[PDB]
Design a protein around this nucleic acid. Structure first.
Ligand SMILES: [Mg+2]
Ligand SMILES: [Mg+2]
Ligand SMILES: [Mg+2]
Ligand SMILES: [Mg+2]
Ligand SMILES: [Mg+2]
Ligand SMILES: [Mg+2]
Ligand SMILES: [Mg+2]
Ligand SMILES: [Mg+2]
Ligand SMILES: [Mg+2]
Ligand SMILES: [Mg+2]
Ligand SMILES: [Mg+2]
Ligand SMILES: [Mg+2]
Ligand SMILES: [Mg+2]
Ligand SMILES: [Mg+2]
Ligand SMILES: [Mg+2]
Ligand SMILES: [Mg+2]
Ligand SMILES: [Mg+2]
Ligand SMILES: [Mg+2]
Ligand SMILES: [Mg+2]
Ligand SMILES: [Mg+2]
Ligand SMILES: [Mg+2]
Ligand SMILES: [Mg+2]
Ligand SMILES: [Mg+2]
Ligand SMILES: [Mg+2]
Ligand SMILES: [Mg+2]
Ligand SMILES: [Mg+2]
Ligand SMILES: [Mg+2]
Ligand SMILES: [Mg+2]
Ligand SMILES: [Mg+2]
Ligand SMILES: [Mg+2]
Ligand SMILES: [Mg+2]
Ligand SMILES: [Mg+2]
Ligand SMILES: [Mg+2]
Ligand SMILES: [Mg+2]
Ligand SMILES: [Mg+2]
Ligand SMILES: [Mg+2]
Ligand SMILES: [Mg+2]
Ligand SMILES: [Mg+2]
Ligand SMILES: [Mg+2]
Lengths: 56, 185, 159, 171, 51, 223
RNA sequence: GAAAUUGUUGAAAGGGAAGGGCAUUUGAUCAGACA
RNA sequence: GGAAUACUGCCAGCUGGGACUGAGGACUGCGACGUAAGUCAAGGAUGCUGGCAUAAUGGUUAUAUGCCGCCCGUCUUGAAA
RNA sequence: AAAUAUGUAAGAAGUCCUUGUUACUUAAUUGAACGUGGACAUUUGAAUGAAGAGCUUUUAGUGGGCCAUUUUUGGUAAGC
RNA sequence: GCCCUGAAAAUGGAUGGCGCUCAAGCGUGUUACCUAUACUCUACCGUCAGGGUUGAUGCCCUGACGAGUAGGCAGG
């Protein structure tokens, strides 16, 4: 016997039950995939300004 | 008929009293429900809800936690409040004196405050001294270090701890855990 | 059998505009992109490398990385009942600076300067736009304009 | 409904290019002023480039009959839509007032040609100045000298269900 | 324990909004406006009665 | 203890006496403010006519909307807009400041609601009889000016008539003064809707759409 | 010594099933309130 | 030329008839009317009078009348089938 | 080349001044990042609403569907 | 336009029925009326919520809400 193949029916209705959320925004985001050079460099740059800020 | 914009007869997701039958716990509540209601004292409110909390929500504060908190600047002389039980920690050596307000103290922890010259206070005693909660430090244990939390959010590439009854190589180490056998997580 | 490919259904989408073909003018290579910029993704069918998948065409997002010939871009894609964060690696021919931010920045300058000339004179600010308000009372005159009265028109065939 | 006649005047919204834009007027037959304003736009949008978004209604004023107790002959010109297509018509209505005639204009076009309100545009209504400028026999009947007719077979609407004598139609 | 409708129940109509007293007493539910003689010019009635 | 009550009592009795005559002062000033506002427009219309010009009224800033359709089988876009105007229930109604921003919320909502321009006499009769406030959620009947003054006082508006004045004038606190009013739960029109079949435009056979001045006759049969 | 099921007696109803619901009429019956 | 009237709208204008409801239970509140002392229709019904004091109201039940009611249970997109 | 649908934006996680850090990058003390210190909170930079927002764990049932409007494919068509 | 012809099926029969002809038909307009578990106001049950206050599962004040198979929980 043949039976239904696909339909999108109701899926939006279920979606909006709990749904649409948001992106969950944060300050200081994930650095995943940033250039590894300038990542290496940005490590020592941050180390420098923290050492300097403690020297005061 | 109404077109409601929110689920009807939905009850507040917060505990209204502790799930315990401990009659002395009830008393401590009965105190702080009076305290919270008749005072401003935001401290009292927090403690009120704190008394309702479940064991999983009242993780022990060790005696070293209290010690490192007292090292905050200007905190040295405050009196620590821990709604929950406080534990002893051998790892520290020099322990300050101060005073602690807690539900329960372990043997070691009691001897370790006292032998440092400090004092052990229950929350009703803390209440009489600080009715508005004056000069208190409130401490909470690390509830997210629990074992079970290792397994929450288990997934591919999620880095969590699988639920496993036995551990080692040949236990869920092979196909899908390593590039060499199939794929990797 | 069914066919869903990476470029499936992009026939018109990736076509180049009428009579704008061939070489890409130099302005697109001289633009400069900074992390936190807002960019408009429109794929360029003459440049096959660094190409967005058809879904992101028309979508706008923020650039999280900057590389030699390309920028990484962040797009929020809804899948299921929530959005998921996507990071896109796109070559600078597929990218353009969003002009929408550009109006906003220009209004913050204008807003800051309005608040200054107001605070220097100590008077009211009101920097938030109001929508169009209904209208105000008018007196239209009849001098030169006598209302020229109109009638519906009989049916007529023009064929 | 029960009709009134309105004067609706309006104009394009003024622009810096063109303040003082030309004004247009229609006599609109309607039941109230809300329909009237709409029906102003309805034809204006047929005759001119305006939407009631890009225009405004300068004035709306009712029009009361000039001589409400004077029996007049009216010519009426209409465009209406049948089922198979669209048609222009001339009919005559003999009545006391311009609204009175437009009321029974719509009854006729409904009854005889099954043409609802939405189908019909009233092209012109004009009192007929001189008798025997009247073309239509079903008016001219009543324009004769010393016109008298009877009303035979008179039906007296009865008050109570039962009557105690055989009724008569006599008049 | 009871909503009372100020548009009936004069006690309440006075409880909110005094000047109810003044209103009634000065009438001004009535109050004829003044009498002006402006006449509409010419062109207005020329176009009013137009075809 | 026995004397200091007449202290606190005679105090408030005077601060009541004071708040009272302030409302008595204000409400007198509103009466003049309306009476002269309308009277100007009338003459301005006369003046235009004598000058052979046409006086065009300003478009209304204030519109009252009541939902005349049931809560079943509503499209999702209008269903949102209907909630965002707080009409979730048949015959319930609120006020809307008229701008292009809410004008399109009247376009999308049009087949489910009847709306128009309410008269002072309506707004008054609405707020006195059906007026309710929003105080920590709960729906509070407005029976004493203190209830208003408590919640709306920070804006001015210590009197039920200051609410009514704030509404009909729009102006500065309309957003807050309006949102304080609990949506008006109206009964069905006593005397009927006057059309056989409701859901069709007012232009078309009545009930649903903008009936302009005619909203007033309606609401007063429901109210 | 229950139920199905049956005899007698007593009350009742019944123009092609019976039984149900709301409501009152009628008949039968019965509780509740004062020294 | 001076009115009237229709229409539409407003009155914190006055008044006749009917219906359902009487929650609450010392006092506290907002008021109104008074020169005043007081009074009130102002944060929920009191006053006056009559009959009965029992199957009368009422409950139960059987019957009668009006309108209404397909046989449950299950599978099912769909069951009185 | 519409309509309806659709992406992004409407600030304190913002704006401006000053001038620290670095192995990156520049011919260059240039830039790129991330900072110290100073300034600006009334309307805190459209509307509406908001009866609260956010977050975690855990587990039932389901995974034969069917119908109406409009869009719409196969079929002469169908209660297909 | 309405009316007629065009217009042939199997038990006896359905504008729902009766019946209706300046309709009880067709087109259209105007009112008055009838009545849903829907709207409005009150009383009551319950559910949720907010607030007060020393049978504590307590007492009190206030508002909103009430459909349900499969299913989950809860009080009995
Ligand atoms: Mg199969
Ligand atoms: Mg399937
Ligand atoms: Mg294919
Ligand atoms: Mg293109
Ligand atoms: Mg193009
Ligand atoms: Mg390649
Ligand atoms: Mg009636
Ligand atoms: Mg009807
Ligand atoms: Mg037996
Ligand atoms: Mg036998
Ligand atoms: Mg019997
Ligand atoms: Mg029987
Ligand atoms: Mg009932
Ligand atoms: Mg006159
Ligand atoms: Mg009148
Ligand atoms: Mg009582
Ligand atoms: Mg009885
Ligand atoms: Mg039956
Ligand atoms: Mg079965
Ligand atoms: Mg099966
Ligand atoms: Mg069955
Ligand atoms: Mg499952
Ligand atoms: Mg199955
Ligand atoms: Mg079927
Ligand atoms: Mg027949
Ligand atoms: Mg019939
Ligand atoms: Mg007739
Ligand atoms: Mg008829
Ligand atoms: Mg029922
Ligand atoms: Mg409670
Ligand atoms: Mg609380
Ligand atoms: Mg409580
Ligand atoms: Mg207590
Ligand atoms: Mg308790
Ligand atoms: Mg209980
Ligand atoms: Mg309690
Ligand atoms: Mg309900
Ligand atoms: Mg339920
Ligand atoms: Mg429910």
């Amino acid at each position: 016997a043949k039976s239904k193949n696909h339909t999108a029916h109701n899926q939006t209705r279920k979606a909006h039950r709990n749904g649409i959320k948001k992106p969950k925004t944060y300050k200081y985001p994930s650095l995943k995939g940033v250039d590894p050079k300038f990542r290496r460099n940005h490590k020592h740059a941050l180390h420098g300004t923290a050492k300097a800020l403690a020297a005061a | 008929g109404i077109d409601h914009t929110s689920k009807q007869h939905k009850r507040s997701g917060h505990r209204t009293a502790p799930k315990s039958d401990n009659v002395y716990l009830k008393l401590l509540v009965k105190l702080y429900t009076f305290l919270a209601r008749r005072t401003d004292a935001p401290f009292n409110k927090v403690v009120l809800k704190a008394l309702f909390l479940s064991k999983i929500n009242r993780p022990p504060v060790s005696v070293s936690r209290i010690a490192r908190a007292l090292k905050q600047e200007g905190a040295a002389n405050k009196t620590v409040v821990v709604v929950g039980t406080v534990t002893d920690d051998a790892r520290i050596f020099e322990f300050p004196k101060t005073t602690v307000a807690a539900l329960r103290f372990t043997a070691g922890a009691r001897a370790k405050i006292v032998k440092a010259g400090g004092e052990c206070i229950t929350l009703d005693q803390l209440a009489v001294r600080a009715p508005k909660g004056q000069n208190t430090l409130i401490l909470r244990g690390p509830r997210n270090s629990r074992e079970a939390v290792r397994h929450f959010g288990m997934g591919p590439h999620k880095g969590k701890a699988p639920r496993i009854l036995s551990t080692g190589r040949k236990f869920e180490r092979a196909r899908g855990r390593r590039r060499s056998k199939g794929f990797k997580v | 059998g069914k066919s869903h490919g990476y470029r499936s259904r992009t026939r018109y989408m990736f076509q180049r505009d009428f009579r704008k073909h061939g070489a890409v003018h130099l302005s697109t290579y001289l633009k400069v992109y900074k992390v936190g910029d807002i960019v408009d993704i429109k794929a360029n069918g003459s440049i096959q490398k660094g190409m967005p998948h058809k879904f992101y065409q028309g979508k706008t997002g923020v650039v999280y990385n900057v590389t030699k010939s390309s920028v990484g871009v962040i797009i929020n894609k809804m899948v299921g009942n929530r959005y998921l964060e996507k990071r896109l690696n796109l070559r600078v021919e597929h990218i353009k600076h969003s002009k929408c931010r550009q109006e906003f920045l220009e209004r913050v300058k204008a807003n800051a300067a309005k608040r200054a000339e107001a605070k220097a004179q100590g008077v009211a600010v009101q920097l938030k736009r109001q929508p169009a308000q209904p209208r105000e009372s008018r007196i239209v005159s009849t001098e030169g304009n006598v209302p020229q009265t109109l009638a519906p028109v009989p049916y007529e065939t023009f064929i | 409904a029960h009709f009134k006649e309105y004067q609706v005047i309006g104009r394009r919204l003024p622009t810096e290019s063109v303040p003082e834009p030309k004004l247009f007027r229609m006599r609109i037959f309607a039941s109230n002023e809300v329909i009237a304003k709409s029906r102003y736009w309805y034809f204006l949008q047929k005759l001119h480039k305006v939407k009631k978004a890009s225009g405004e209604i300068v004035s709306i004023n009712q029009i009361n009959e000039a001589h409400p107790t004077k029996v007049k002959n009216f010519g009426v010109w209409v465009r209406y839509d049948s089922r198979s297509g669209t048609h222009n018509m001339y009919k005559e209505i003999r009545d006391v007032s311009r609204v009175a005639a437009v009321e029974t204009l719509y009854q006729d076009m409904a009854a005889r040609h099954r043409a609802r309100f939405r189908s019909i545009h009233i092209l012109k209504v004009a009192e007929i100045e001189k008798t025997a400028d009247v073309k239509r026999q079903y008016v001219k009947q009543f324009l004769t000298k010393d016109l008298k007719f009877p009303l035979p077979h008179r039906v007296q609407k009865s008050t109570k269900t039962f009557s105690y004598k055989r009724p008569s139609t006599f008049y | 324990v009871l909503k009372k409708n100020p548009l009936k129940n004069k006690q309440v109509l006075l409880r909110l909004n005094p000047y109810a007293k003044v209103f009634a007493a000065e009438k001004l539910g009535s109050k004829k406006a003044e009498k002006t003689g402006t006449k509409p010019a010419a062109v207005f009635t020329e176009t009013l009665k137009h075809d | 203890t026995a004397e200091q009550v007449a202290a606190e009592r005679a105090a408030r009795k005077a601060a009541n006496k004071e708040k009272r005559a302030i409302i008595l002062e204000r409400n007198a000033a509103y009466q003049k403010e309306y009476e002269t506002a309308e009277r100007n427009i009338i003459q301005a219309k006369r003046d235009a006519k004598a000058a052979g010009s046409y006086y065009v009224e300003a478009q209304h800033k204030l519109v009252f909307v009541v939902r005349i359709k049931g809560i079943n089988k509503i499209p999702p876009k209008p269903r949102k807009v209907l909630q965002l105007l707080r009409l979730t229930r048949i015959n319930s109604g609120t006020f809307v400041k008229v701008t292009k921003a809410t004008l399109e919320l009247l376009k999308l909502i049009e087949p489910y609601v009847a709306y128009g321009y309410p008269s002072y006499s309506t707004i008054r009769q609405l707020v006195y009889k059906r007026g309710f406030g929003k105080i920590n959620k709960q729906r509070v009947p407005l029976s004493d000016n203190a209830i208003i003054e408590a919640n709306l006082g920070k804006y001015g508006i210590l009197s039920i008539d200051d609410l009514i004045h704030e509404i009909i004038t729009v102006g500065p606190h309309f957003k807050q003064a309006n949102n304080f009013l609990w949506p008006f739960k109206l009964s069905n029109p006593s005397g009927g809707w006057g059309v056989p079949r409701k859901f069709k435009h007012f232009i078309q056979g009545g009930s649903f759409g903008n009936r302009e001045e005619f909203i007033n006759k309606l609401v007063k049969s429901m109210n």
